[PDB]
From a paper:
Bacterial infections including Salmonellosis and Shigellosis affect millions of people every year. These bacteria use a T3SS to secrete virulence factors to manipulate host cells. The T3SS is a multi-component system that forms a continuous protein transport channel through the two bacterial membranes and the periplasmatic space that extends into the surrounding medium by a needle structure. Tip proteins, which bind to the distal end of the T3SS needle, are thought to play an important role in this process. SipD from S. typhimurium, IpaD from Shigella flexneri and BipD from Burkholderia mallei are tip proteins that are thought to interact with their corresponding needle subunits PrgI, MxiH and BsaL, respectively, to make the needle tip complex.
Here, we address the questions of how the Salmonella SipD interacts with PrgI and deoxycholate and the mechanistic consequences of the assembly of the T3SS needle tip complex. We could show that two different proteins, structurally conserved in many pathogenic bacteria, bind each other to constitute the needle tip of the transport system.
Author numbering: 6 to 77, 129 to 178, 186 to 335
């Protein structure tokens, strides 16, 4: 509709550039495989590329609203009007990250609850059975597909919402989660919490050996320290996953704010 074609066509150039940048970022990383900086740069670019492809596949719905509102102009007002007419984007980008962090925070919080009754389970004697049982119930509970376990899509109220394999895999790589987090359900797929640290924990408790009639098992300090160390390490792993996803979210808010600035500029300029 008039300038809209100008915003979109100029916008497509953006997707091409990011696409090129992603590859370029990836090659720099290929030269130094374990370089943290280059990895972070590449994934921010990947996320950003996905964001623009998001916007692109929503131009109709979005240009509709924005245009309808341009028809009832300041620049801080262009920005404002753009800000409140791109929910199709923010909800499938930021809203997704919002859900990802809330769900993972509750998942972790549930683990914390189990950790909170360790004293009541402690040479030294550990309640192998009681501990392993609480862990296994956590594994099974979060190994299912419901509102407490799904990171993407966001589960809106009642009923399970799925996505295509491609969409789920896209989020799987952006969230940097492992294959075990991708599950099939009905017509499509979903991305859930990573249970690997928890499963390693029980796998470690079993390595401790068969418990006594106590259903508990006494062990000499040597192997106790080694066990609790291995256990605390798995906990830090979950805690690290929660932090990295929180950091991805904060980065996405920034990338999103820059997409809105660009969108606003192209529109404001398409007038002049």
């Amino acid at each position: 509709s008039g300038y809209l074609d100008d915003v979109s066509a100029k916008f497509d150039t953006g997707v091409d550039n990011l696409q090129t940048q992603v590859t370029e970022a990836l090659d720099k990383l290929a030269a130094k495989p374990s370089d943290p900086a280059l990895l972070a740069a590449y994934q921010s670019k990947l996320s950003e590329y996905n964001l623009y492809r998001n916007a692109q596949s929503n131009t109709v719905k979005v240009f509709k609203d924005i245009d309808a509102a341009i028809i009832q102009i300041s620049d801080a007002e262009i920005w404002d009007m753009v800000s409140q007419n791109i929910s199709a984007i923010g909800d499938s980008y930021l809203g997704v990250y919002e859900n990802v962090v809330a769900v993972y925070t509750d998942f972790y919080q549930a683990f914390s609850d189990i950790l909170s009754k360790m004293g009541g389970w402690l040479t030294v004697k550990l309640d192998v059975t009681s501990l392993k049982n609480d862990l296994n119930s956590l594994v099974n509970k979060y190994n299912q597909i419901n509102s407490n376990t799904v990171l993407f899509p966001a589960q809106s109220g009642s009923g399970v919402k799925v996505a295509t394999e491609a969409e789920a895999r896209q989020w799987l790589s952006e969230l940097n989660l492992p294959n075990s987090c991708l599950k099939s359900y009905g017509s499509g797929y979903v991305v859930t919490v990573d249970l690997t640290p928890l499963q390693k924990m029980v796998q470690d408790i079993d390595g401790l050996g068969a418990p006594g009639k106590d259903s508990k098992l006494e062990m000499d300090n040597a192997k106790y320290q080694a066990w609790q160390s291995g256990f605390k390490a798995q906990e830090e792993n979950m805690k690290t996953t929660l932090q990295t996803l929180t950091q991805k979210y904060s980065n996405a808010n920034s990338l999103y704010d820059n997409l809105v600035k660009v969108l606003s500029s192209t529109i404001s300029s398409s007038l002049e």
